[PDB]
Every structure is written in C-alpha cells, then in structure tokens.
Amino acid sequence: SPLAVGLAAHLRQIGGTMYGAYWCPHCQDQKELFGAAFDQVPYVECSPNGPGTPQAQECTEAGITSYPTWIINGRTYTGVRSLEALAVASGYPL
Numbered sequence: 001s002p003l004a005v006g007l008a009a010h011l012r013q014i015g016g017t018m019y020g021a022y023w024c025p026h027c028q029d030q031k032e033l034f035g036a037a038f039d040q041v042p043y044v045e046c047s048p049n050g051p052g053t054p055q056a057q058e059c060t061e062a063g064i065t066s067y068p069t070w071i072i073n074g075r076t077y078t079g080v081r082s083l084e085a086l087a088v089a090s091g092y093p094l
C-alpha cells in the first residue's frame with residue numbers, strides 16, 4: 001500500500017512508536033493493516049518472554065498498560081488504529 005509505506009516512513013521519521021506483544025491478536029491486527037510496510041514502523045516488543053510473564057522493563061517504565069499502545073508526538077493512543085487514524089494522529093495527509 002502506498003499509504004501504508006508513506007505513513008510508515010512518516011512515523012519512523014517523527015519517532016511515532018508502537019508498543020506491543022508479538023503474540024497479541026490486536027497487535028497482529030495492527031501490523032496487518034500495514035502489511036509488509038510495517039517494517040519501517042518503530043516497534044517495541046513488550047513481551048519477549050510471552051503471555052503471563054512480566055513485560056519488558058522499557059514498557060513498564062513507559063507506563064504501557066495495554067497492547068498495542070502508540071506514542072506519537074508525545075501523545076498516547078491505546079488499541080488498534082486504522083491507517084487513517086494514524087495519519088491523523090501523526091499529521092500525515094489524506
């Protein structure tokens with residue numbers, strides 16, 4: 001998707017970051033909106049050790065309490081967001 005690639009680059013450039021868990025269905029749904037374009041999106045893995053385990057120190061210290069959580073322009077957006085919603089949050093056109 002041209003929108004997905006353009007938006008992903010934009011998120012990378014402004015440091016818009018997704019915090020999630022590789023095994024979390026919502027996180028998987030979020031990545032799937034981007035498809036392969038997700039490769040550019042800054043992503044923090046909060047659960048490298050899997051379900052039920054204490055999350056990554058960086059996630060606890062960032063105050064992550066749900067997956068996915070986006071931090072974009074210092075603003076916090078919890079849960080899955082459409083490409084359109086992420087464009088609006090990040091100031092990416094159309």
